[PDB]
Amino acid sequence: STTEELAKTFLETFNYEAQELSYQSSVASWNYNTNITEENVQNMNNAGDKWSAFLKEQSTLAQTYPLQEIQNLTVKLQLQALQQNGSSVLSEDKSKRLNTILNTMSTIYSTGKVCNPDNPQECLLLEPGLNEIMANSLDYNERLWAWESWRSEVGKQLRPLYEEYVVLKNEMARANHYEDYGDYWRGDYEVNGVDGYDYSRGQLIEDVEHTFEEIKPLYEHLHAYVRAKLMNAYPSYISPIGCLPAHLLGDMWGRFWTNLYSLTVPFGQKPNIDVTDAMVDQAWDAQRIFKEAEKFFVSVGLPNMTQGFWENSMLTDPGNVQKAVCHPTAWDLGKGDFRILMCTKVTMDDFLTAHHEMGHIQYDMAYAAQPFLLRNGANEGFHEAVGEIMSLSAATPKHLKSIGLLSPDFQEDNETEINFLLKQALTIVGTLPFTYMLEKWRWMVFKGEIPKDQWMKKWWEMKREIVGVVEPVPHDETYCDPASLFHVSNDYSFIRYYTRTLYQFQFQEALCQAAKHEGPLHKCDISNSTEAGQKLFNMLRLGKSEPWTLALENVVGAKNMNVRPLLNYFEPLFTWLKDQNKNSFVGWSTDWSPYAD
Amino acid sequence: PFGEVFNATKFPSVYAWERKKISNCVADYSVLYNSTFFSTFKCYGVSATKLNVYADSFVVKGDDVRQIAPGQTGVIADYNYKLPDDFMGCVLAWNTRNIDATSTGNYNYKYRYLRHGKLRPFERDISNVPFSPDGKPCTPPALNCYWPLNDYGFYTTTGIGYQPYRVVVLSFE
Ligand SMILES: [Cl-]
Ligand SMILES: [Zn+2]
Numbered sequence: 001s002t003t004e005e006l007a008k009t010f011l012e013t014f015n016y017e018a019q020e021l022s023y024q025s026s027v028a029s030w031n032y033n034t035n036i037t038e039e040n041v042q043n044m045n046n047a048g049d050k051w052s053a054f055l056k057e058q059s060t061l062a063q064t065y066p067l068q069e070i071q072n073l074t075v076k077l078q079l080q081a082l083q084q085n086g087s088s089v090l091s092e093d094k095s096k097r098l099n100t101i102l103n104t105m106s107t108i109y110s111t112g113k114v115c116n117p118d119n120p121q122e123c124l125l126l127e128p129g130l131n132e133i134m135a136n137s138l139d140y141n142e143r144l145w146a147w148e149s150w151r152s153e154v155g156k157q158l159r160p161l162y163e164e165y166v167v168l169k170n171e172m173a174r175a176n177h178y179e180d181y182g183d184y185w186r187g188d189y190e191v192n193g194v195d196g197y198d199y200s201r202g203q204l205i206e207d208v209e210h211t212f213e214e215i216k217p218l219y220e221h222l223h224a225y226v227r228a229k230l231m232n233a234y235p236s237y238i239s240p241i242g243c244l245p246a247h248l249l250g251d252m253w254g255r256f257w258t259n260l261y262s263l264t265v266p267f268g269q270k271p272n273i274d275v276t277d278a279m280v281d282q283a284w285d286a287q288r289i290f291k292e293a294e295k296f297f298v299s300v301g302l303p304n305m306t307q308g309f310w311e312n313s314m315l316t317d318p319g320n321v322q323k324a325v326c327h328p329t330a331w332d333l334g335k336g337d338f339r340i341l342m343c344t345k346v347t348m349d350d351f352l353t354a355h356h357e358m359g360h361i362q363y364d365m366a367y368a369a370q371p372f373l374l375r376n377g378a379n380e381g382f383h384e385a386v387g388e389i390m391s392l393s394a395a396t397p398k399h400l401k402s403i404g405l406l407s408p409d410f411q412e413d414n415e416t417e418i419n420f421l422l423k424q425a426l427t428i429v430g431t432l433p434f435t436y437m438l439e440k441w442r443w444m445v446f447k448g449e450i451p452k453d454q455w456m457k458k459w460w461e462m463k464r465e466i467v468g469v470v471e472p473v474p475h476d477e478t479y480c481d482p483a484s485l486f487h488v489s490n491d492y493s494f495i496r497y498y499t500r501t502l503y504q505f506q507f508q509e510a511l512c513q514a515a516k517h518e519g520p521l522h523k524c525d526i527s528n529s530t531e532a533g534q535k536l537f538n539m540l541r542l543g544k545s546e547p548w549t550l551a552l553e554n555v556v557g558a559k560n561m562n563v564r565p566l567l568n569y570f571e572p573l574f575t576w577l578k579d580q581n582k583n584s585f586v587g588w589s590t591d592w593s594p595y596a597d
Numbered sequence: 598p599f600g601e602v603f604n605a606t607k608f609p610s611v612y613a614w615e616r617k618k619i620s621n622c623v624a625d626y627s628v629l630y631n632s633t634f635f636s637t638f639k640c641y642g643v644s645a646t647k648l649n650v651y652a653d654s655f656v657v658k659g660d661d662v663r664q665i666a667p668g669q670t671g672v673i674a675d676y677n678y679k680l681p682d683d684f685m686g687c688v689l690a691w692n693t694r695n696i697d698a699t700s701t702g703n704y705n706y707k708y709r710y711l712r713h714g715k716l717r718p719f720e721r722d723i724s725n726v727p728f729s730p731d732g733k734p735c736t737p738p739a740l741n742c743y744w745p746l747n748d749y750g751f752y753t754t755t756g757i758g759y760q761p762y763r764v765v766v767l768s769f770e
Contacts, residue, residue: 001730006741009711009730013743016710020750024702027754064740308756336756 004075007065011078014058015372018051019334025051026333034314034341036323059084073193074545078373081544089175090168098168101161105489108161112154114146126150126252134252135259140234144472147247151481158489159480163452166445169491173446182446185493188380191547196559199549205443208498211563212436218570219433221577222425223468224586226257229264241585242592243470246463249430253485254469257430261423266576270416273397275405276347282405286315286344289351292403293358296394300526300533302362309338309361317343328353330360330387332375338364351405355394359387367543374544378551380493381500386540388504389511396525412523421522421573429570432501437466439495441482453477464590472594502566506556509565511536521568598622599629602652603689608697608763610707611677612746613723614655623648629689636762637662637690641680642769651768653678653719656697656706658749660758662690665766674716676709678766681718686769690762697761698751706761711745719768 028047032040062082070076087095114130115123124130133146166181173181178201186201223244230248231238237245250259257264290313294305317326326343328350333339338361344350363386367375377383393399400406441462444450450458456475459482463469475481483489512524515532526532539554549559556562567574602617609615626646629635657665657673664674665688667681674680680688697703711728727735728745735742751761 005730009741009743012710016747020748023750023752023755027752061740306756308754312754333754335752335754336758337752337754338756 003065003069004072007070007075007079010062010065011075011082011371011373014062014082018054018058018372021047021051021054023333023335023337026331030331030333030339030341033329034318034324036325055084056088058082059086060088074371074374077544078371081373085176087169087172090172094168094171098165098172101165101168102491105158105161105165105483105491108154108157109486109489112150112157114149114153131252134247135250138233140237140248143247144245147252148473150252151475151479151484155479155481155484158483159478162480162483162489170446180446180448182443185495188493189499189548191549194547194550197547197549199547204495207561208436208495211502211561212433214563214567215429215432218567218574218577219429220586221574221581222429223588224581224584225577226260226264226426228584230260233263237594239589239592241589243464243468243588243590245472245594246469247472249469250426253434255431255434255485257426258423261426264422264426266418266422267415270413270419273395273416273420274348275351275400276349278405278407279346279348279351284346286346289344289346289354290315290340290358292351293355293394296355296390296527297358297362297533299528299530300536301530302533302537303365305358305361306336306338306365308336309340312337313339314341315344328357330357330364332361332364332368334375336368352391352394355390356387359390363387363540366537366540367545369541370543370545376544378539378542378544378546378548379499380496381503382548382551384496384500385504385507386536388500389507392504392508392522393525393527396523398523399525399527402525402527417572418576421570425570425573428501428566432498433467434469435494435498437462438482438485438488439493439498440466442488442494456481461590464588468588470593474595499561502561502563503552505565505569506552506562507536509568510556520572521565522572599624599652602654602765603629605654608654608656608693611655611657611661611673612707612709614653614678614721617652617654619650619652622650635689635691637688639666640687641667641685642687649769651766651770653764653766653768655764656693656749656761657708657764658751658758659692659756659760659762661708662762662764665690665764671715672710673708676712676716676722679716679718679720680766684718684768687767689765689767692757692760693763694751694753694760697763698753698755700753703751703761704748706749706751707746708749709745710747711743 025047028044032044059082062079063085065079067076067079067083070079087098090098109126111125113123113125124133130146130150133142137143137146169181173179173184176184178184178187183201186204189199189204190201191197191199227238227244228240230244231240234248237248244254246254250257290305298304314324318324324341324343328342329340331339331341340354340357340361342350342354342357344354360383363377363383364375377386397406397410397412401408401410441450441459444458445455455477456479460471460475463471486492487494508524508526509521511526511529511532512521514535515524515526515529517524517526535555539551542551542554545551552561553559556565598619625648629638655678661673663669664671665678665680667683667685671679697706709722712722713728713732716722725744725746727737727742729735729741737744749761751759
């Protein structure tokens with residue numbers, strides 16, 4: 001019969017096969033990450049090695065069906081995915097080299113350590129040696145030291161590899177009919193043949209730039225405001241018009257200005273939005289946390305976690321004698337088996353965390369009716385937004401009272417709320433520009449608009465114009481800073497963090513609307529909302545099924561990534577800052593420098 | 598004589614389901630009535646006692662069970678086992694996870710997922726011959742050859758949609 005009918009029957013065989021090998025690889029990693037034995041680690045590879053071999057075999061076997069001869073959207077969508085041709089289009093020896101290049105970088109980043117020139121024997125690695133310094137230390141020099149050491153030892157070390165990395169990965173990219181490796185990633189957001197729901201790999205850059213403009217003013221002011229506060233912190237090192245020094249931004253890159261709350265806090269006097277001590281007093285345990293989260297979704301029209309979830313998940317650290325990697329994770333192993341691995345402590349952060357995680361699990365269930373290859377969030381950033389929407393509602397004092405963890409007679413005064421947002425801003429809005437300029441330079445390097453010998457003369461040109469940040473010591477091509485960040489030296493799309501952030505607010509807004517919500521868009525808790533949950537599910541249940549723009553419509557109301565809902569969330573701040581900046585200077589000069597020399 | 602089909606120690610794969618013919622026998626059906634051992638008892642006929650029968654039995658995935666009833670598209674009702682639009686009695690199931698499934702995976706039970714044409718009420722097909730979507734003797738690994746039989750793989754940890762369940766279809770005549 002037609003190329004189509006053979007292809008229907010090809011996928012069907014694949015679904016059932018993948019189901020098995022995938023559930024085997026999954027199950028293996030589960031047993032590993034929860035019980036780091038020596039026999040356990042072995043098959044954790046085997047199963048996964050088998051499964052990865054299966055795709056290679058399958059993808060290249062799916063080469064037989066010319067996708068450009070089919071029409072049942074879904075079938076075409078599935079095959080498209082299966083044709084993960086990837087980095088086998090290279091010669092076996094180039095792919096060898098490439099996977100070595102990748103592999104070495106990953107190793108260098110984690111293994112990399114620096115030594116105290118003032119003490120031979122003491123030597124630290126990023127986590128946790130340096131990260132502690134970068135997030136806590138108030139000593140300008142100590143900071144300047146950590147920051148530089150890192151970009152100097154491992155940075156330079158990764159310079160040669162990244163150089164080669166770019167050519168090869170670009171080769172890979174050009175082979176599959178993409179302009180560059182950059183044009184490859186933008187791919188994730190692409191939509192074809194639907195009308196109005198379409199989207200192209202170019203238009204991302206257009207929409208990410210058109211959106212990033214409306215953010216400037218808020219950023220500019222948040223910038224200006226933390227600037228002045230920093231000046232007190234490190235008097236005489238900052239210029240009331242000049243950029244911020246990269247090492248005083250609160251982590252190893254200033255990805256997040258979260259850690260500056262300490263010294264940028266508006267009103268140091270208003271204190272504890274923190275129920276840690278209240279949960280402990282009512283003898284709350286792991287069980288209670290998760291049962292409560294489960295209740296939250298139940299409240300909006302969603303299902304109780306499966307009996308499989310309750311008797312399979314690992315909800316507490318199992319002490320010594322049996323060790324685990326304790327990163328909180330949502331697992332969709334398939335076969336209708338879902339679970340969470342979380343080394344729960346009875347604290348607010350974990351109360352929050354677990355609502356986020358049970359977010360993805362909730363998402364995973366939603367789209368598990370979809371054909372095997374279409375189970376997964378509508379794009380790279382979709383799963384994270386949905387997960388973070390929960391953290392937003394479960395944090396409000398409204399919910400905290402609702403559940404008897406906030407003493408009934410608390411007040412929501414204006415000062416506590418400013419304090420909140422600033423904390424939110426420091427993370428949510430701090431990173432947005434830092435992120436955009438990340439993939440901006442990455443994107444460019446890939447399009448070839450940056451000559452190898454200006455990889456830092458261009459990095460910091462942008463770091464000063466987009467982000468308002470300056471290097472404390474001058475950096476030539478010996479260094480390779482953009483790659484001192486995990487995401488970069490370990491091969492990852494980073495724009496995800498910029499687009500999710502916007503998405504997540506377009507969600508909360510349309511939902512709080514739907515749920516009927518009174519106050520500022522941030523006082524919103526969508527519990528008991530029923531009809532406001534339905535609207536969520538409506539998209540959650542598609543997964544990769546429909547074009548992502550439709551996936552969105554179903555929630556927000558339109559086909560595009562809109563920025564205003566993020567800005568709305570921050571009105572009460574944005575204004576109070578325009579005020580604060582009364583006499584502060586807003587914006588920066590790219591010309592000024594710390595070293596200055 | 599019912600003790601011989603339920604309570605029985607080994608069950609067959611849907612594709613090769615077994616029929617038992619019970620006549621002359623006397624049984625009160627009270628063996629079956631009372632019992633929270635069953636999870637499915639949809640009786641597309643009645644529920645009484647005159648003390649008089651065909652008793653097909655097999656194994657399907659959980660979410661598979663809803664296809665042992667008149668109508669229903671298939672994969673199972675299309676290819677392994679099909680009840681008639683009408684002439685009916687009862688259908689019975691029970692989660693046999695502890696029995697037919699292991700933590701390591703039990704792939705003994707099979708089902709059919711490719712066939713030219715659908716089955717007729719109470720038909721069976723024990724053929725295992727390389728399938729190509731257009732006659733033509735297949736010869737694996739030749740492209741577009743598939744063996745029409747598939748394993749189930751029942752793990753204890755899976756969701757209830759994917760756990761093994763034994764079935765007994767009781768037909769009255
Ligand atoms: Cl940097
Ligand atoms: Zn997450």
